[PDB]
Design a protein around this ligand. Sequence first.
Ligand SMILES: *[C@@H]1O[C@H](CO)[C@@H](O)[C@H](O)[C@H]1NC(C)=O
Ligand SMILES: *[C@@H]1O[C@H](CO)[C@@H](O)[C@H](O)[C@H]1NC(C)=O
Lengths: 49, 49
Amino acid sequence: INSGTTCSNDLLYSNTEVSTGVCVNYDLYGITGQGIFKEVSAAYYNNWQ
Amino acid sequence: DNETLEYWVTPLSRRQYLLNFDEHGVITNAVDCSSSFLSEIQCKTQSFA
Ligand SMILES: *[C@@H]1O[C@H](CO)[C@@H](O)[C@H](O)[C@H]1NC(C)=O
Ligand SMILES: *[C@@H]1O[C@H](CO)[C@@H](O)[C@H](O)[C@H]1NC(C)=O
């Protein structure tokens, strides 16, 4: 629950931009919460992570 | 040419390990928590040293 790509479209919203530096509510592919984003240069993600 | 076939098999069970992840996210070390006394100390401190 709250993670994956089997999604229910009963409440449909449009995709927004990932805005950085401000406190936001987020719903990232099921993951929900509140926080501040910061764009980074990461090299530790494989093709399945 | 002095080649050999090898296929080593051991059984699996559900058990607790302590894993060490490095800077790149690679598993480098593991300890089975119920195998020895030092492994019990390592799993109760959550430290490899
Ligand atoms: C605080 O407010 C300023 C606008 O005055 C904004 O640029 C900044 O991102 C805000 N800080 C946070 C953490 O939201
Ligand atoms: C294979 O092992 C035998 C041992 O009697 C040796 O004489 C032979 O040279 C070896 N061949 C190779 C390719 O290593």
